Design an enzyme around this catalytic site. Structure first.
Site, short mmCIF file in Angstrom:
data_model
loop_
_atom_site.label_atom_id
_atom_site.label_comp_id
_atom_site.label_asym_id
_atom_site.label_seq_id
_atom_site.Cartn_x
_atom_site.Cartn_y
_atom_site.Cartn_z
N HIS A 84 3.00 -2.48 5.64
CA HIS A 84 2.23 -3.45 6.43
C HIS A 84 1.67 -4.48 5.46
O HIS A 84 1.93 -4.43 4.26
CB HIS A 84 1.19 -2.83 7.38
CG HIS A 84 0.04 -2.14 6.73
ND1 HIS A 84 0.08 -0.82 6.32
CD2 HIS A 84 -1.23 -2.57 6.50
CE1 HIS A 84 -1.10 -0.49 5.83
NE2 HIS A 84 -1.91 -1.52 5.95
N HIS A 86 -1.41 -5.42 4.37
CA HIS A 86 -2.64 -5.32 3.59
C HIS A 86 -2.34 -5.17 2.09
O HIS A 86 -1.24 -4.81 1.67
CB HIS A 86 -3.49 -4.15 4.10
CG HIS A 86 -4.09 -4.39 5.45
ND1 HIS A 86 -4.51 -3.37 6.26
CD2 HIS A 86 -4.44 -5.53 6.09
CE1 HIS A 86 -5.03 -3.84 7.37
NE2 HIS A 86 -5.02 -5.16 7.28
N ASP A 88 -3.17 -3.02 -0.11
CA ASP A 88 -2.72 -1.72 -0.60
C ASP A 88 -1.23 -1.47 -0.38
O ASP A 88 -0.71 -0.44 -0.83
CB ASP A 88 -3.58 -0.57 -0.04
CG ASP A 88 -3.61 -0.46 1.51
OD1 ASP A 88 -3.71 -1.53 2.18
OD2 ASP A 88 -3.63 0.70 2.01
N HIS A 149 -2.77 1.48 12.93
CA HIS A 149 -3.65 0.92 11.92
C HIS A 149 -3.54 -0.59 11.86
O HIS A 149 -4.52 -1.29 11.57
CB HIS A 149 -3.28 1.57 10.59
CG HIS A 149 -3.88 0.88 9.42
ND1 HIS A 149 -5.18 1.08 9.03
CD2 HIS A 149 -3.37 -0.06 8.61
CE1 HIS A 149 -5.44 0.30 8.00
NE2 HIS A 149 -4.36 -0.39 7.73
N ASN A 180 -10.06 2.08 7.56
CA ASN A 180 -10.36 0.66 7.74
C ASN A 180 -9.63 0.17 8.98
O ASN A 180 -8.40 0.02 8.98
CB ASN A 180 -9.97 -0.14 6.52
CG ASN A 180 -10.54 -1.52 6.56
OD1 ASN A 180 -10.82 -2.05 7.64
ND2 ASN A 180 -10.73 -2.12 5.39
C1 LIG Z 1 -6.91 -3.05 1.73
C2 LIG Z 1 -7.19 -2.24 3.02
C3 LIG Z 1 -8.38 -1.18 2.78
C4 LIG Z 1 -9.50 -1.43 1.95
C5 LIG Z 1 -10.50 -0.44 1.76
C6 LIG Z 1 -10.40 0.80 2.40
C7 LIG Z 1 -9.27 1.06 3.25
C8 LIG Z 1 -8.85 2.14 4.05
C9 LIG Z 1 -9.52 3.51 4.24
C10 LIG Z 1 -10.88 3.60 4.47
C11 LIG Z 1 -11.45 4.88 4.61
C12 LIG Z 1 -10.67 6.03 4.52
C13 LIG Z 1 -11.37 7.42 4.69
S1 LIG Z 1 -11.41 7.84 6.56
C14 LIG Z 1 -9.65 7.97 7.02
O1 LIG Z 1 -12.06 9.13 6.86
O2 LIG Z 1 -12.09 6.78 7.34
C15 LIG Z 1 -9.30 5.92 4.27
F1 LIG Z 1 -8.46 7.01 4.16
C16 LIG Z 1 -8.72 4.65 4.13
C17 LIG Z 1 -7.65 1.75 4.62
C18 LIG Z 1 -6.79 2.49 5.63
O3 LIG Z 1 -7.40 3.13 6.54
O4 LIG Z 1 -5.56 2.30 5.68
N1 LIG Z 1 -7.35 0.54 4.24
C19 LIG Z 1 -8.30 0.08 3.43
N2 LIG Z 1 -7.58 -3.09 4.11
C20 LIG Z 1 -8.15 -4.39 4.10
C21 LIG Z 1 -8.36 -4.74 5.49
C22 LIG Z 1 -8.95 -6.03 6.13
C23 LIG Z 1 -9.16 -7.20 5.14
N3 LIG Z 1 -9.49 -8.35 5.94
O5 LIG Z 1 -7.98 -3.75 6.35
C24 LIG Z 1 -7.49 -2.67 5.50
O6 LIG Z 1 -7.08 -1.66 5.91
ZN LIG Z 2 -4.05 -1.38 5.97
ZN LIG Z 3 -4.31 1.62 4.14
#
Ligand SMILES: C[C@@H](c1cccc2c(-c3ccc(CS(C)(=O)=O)c(F)c3)c(C(=O)O)[nH]c12)N1CC(CCN)OC1=O
Ligand SMILES: [Zn+2]
Ligand SMILES: [Zn+2]
Length: 231
Positions: A84, A86, A88, A149, A180
């Site tokens: 996707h 993002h 990461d 997601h 996120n």
């Molecule tokens: C770059 C990325 C991003 C950055 C930081 C954290 C994450 C998390 C995340 C968070 C918490 C948990 C623990 S838990 C399941 O218990 O909650 C987890 F496993 C993953 C994810 C995801 O979930 O894939 N993506 C993240 N980004 C950026 C973005 C919008 C930018 N405008 O959106 C996104 O995903």
């Molecule tokens: Zn993502």
């Molecule tokens: Zn992610």
């Protein structure tokens, strides 16, 4: 020997973990909004070459990924797919492109990356625009389950090993919320997970986008945490 975490992973370092014959995950850590997170990708042996799934979340992390692959595996990464838009998943695509790697993503991912200012894979993957679509790409199948997601998230299956790489549409068993959710569709996500469950009933290992691999229970757990996040 155990699956690595941030406590073993300083930001900038990359670990590989053998999942099955010819299949590894890669694990790296990154800071985002003042917190540190792990994230996974996949490496699949493709004859004398390697297919990479997802960057290591950042340019320097992705350079470190390529060095770790050379150290541990020693075969060239020739193609990469980002699952996707993002950072990461695509952050590091420019590094890959300058290291001889052909980078791919769906047109939906490419458009979203471009619009958001993220790095943009070079090549478009057609044939994935409708939920339930699947295409072959080297030693994997790519599958579009529907919005979860993100609207563009893809899933990757390694048929030789029955490895299901869920990417960020799938969460680890310890997760307490849906991660996120900035770009998520919480209403559609359970339906998309159900499509994954129906399509890959013989999966033996399930790898989430962040956190520890496990078995098929990760899919049900994900549906559970998303339904409760929504509510
Ligand atoms: C770059 C990325 C991003 C950055 C930081 C954290 C994450 C998390 C995340 C968070 C918490 C948990 C623990 S838990 C399941 O218990 O909650 C987890 F496993 C993953 C994810 C995801 O979930 O894939 N993506 C993240 N980004 C950026 C973005 C919008 C930018 N405008 O959106 C996104 O995903
Ligand atoms: Zn993502
Ligand atoms: Zn992610």
């Amino acid at each position: 020997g155990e699956y690595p975490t941030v406590n073993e992973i300083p930001v900038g370092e990359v670990r590989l973990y053998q999942i099955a014959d010819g299949v590894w995950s890669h694990i790296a850590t990154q800071s985002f909004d003042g917190a540190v997170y792990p994230s996974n990708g996949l490496i699949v042996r493709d004859g004398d070459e390697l297919l990479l799934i997802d960057t290591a979340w950042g340019a320097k992390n992705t350079a470190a990924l390529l060095a770790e692959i050379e150290k541990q595996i020693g075969l060239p990464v020739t193609r990469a797919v980002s699952t996707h838009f993002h950072d990461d998943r695509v952050g590091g695509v420019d590094v890959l492109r300058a290291a001889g790697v052909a980078t791919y993503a769906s047109p939906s991912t490419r458009r979203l990356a471009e619009a958001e200012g993220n790095e943009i894979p070079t090549h478009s993957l057609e044939g994935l625009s409708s939920s339930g679509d699947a295409v072959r790409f080297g030693p994997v199948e790519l599958f579009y389950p529907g919005a979860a997601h993100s609207t563009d998230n893809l899933v990757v299956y390694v048929p030789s090993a029955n490895v299901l790489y869920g990417g960020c549409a799938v969460h680890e068993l310890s997760s307490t919320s849906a991660g996120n959710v900035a770009d998520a569709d919480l209403a559609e996500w359970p339906t998309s997970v159900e499509r994954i469950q129906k399509h890959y009933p013989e999966a033996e290992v399930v790898i989430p986008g962040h956190g520890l691999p496990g078995g098929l229970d990760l899919l049900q757990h994900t549906a559970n945490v998303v339904k409760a996040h929504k509510n």
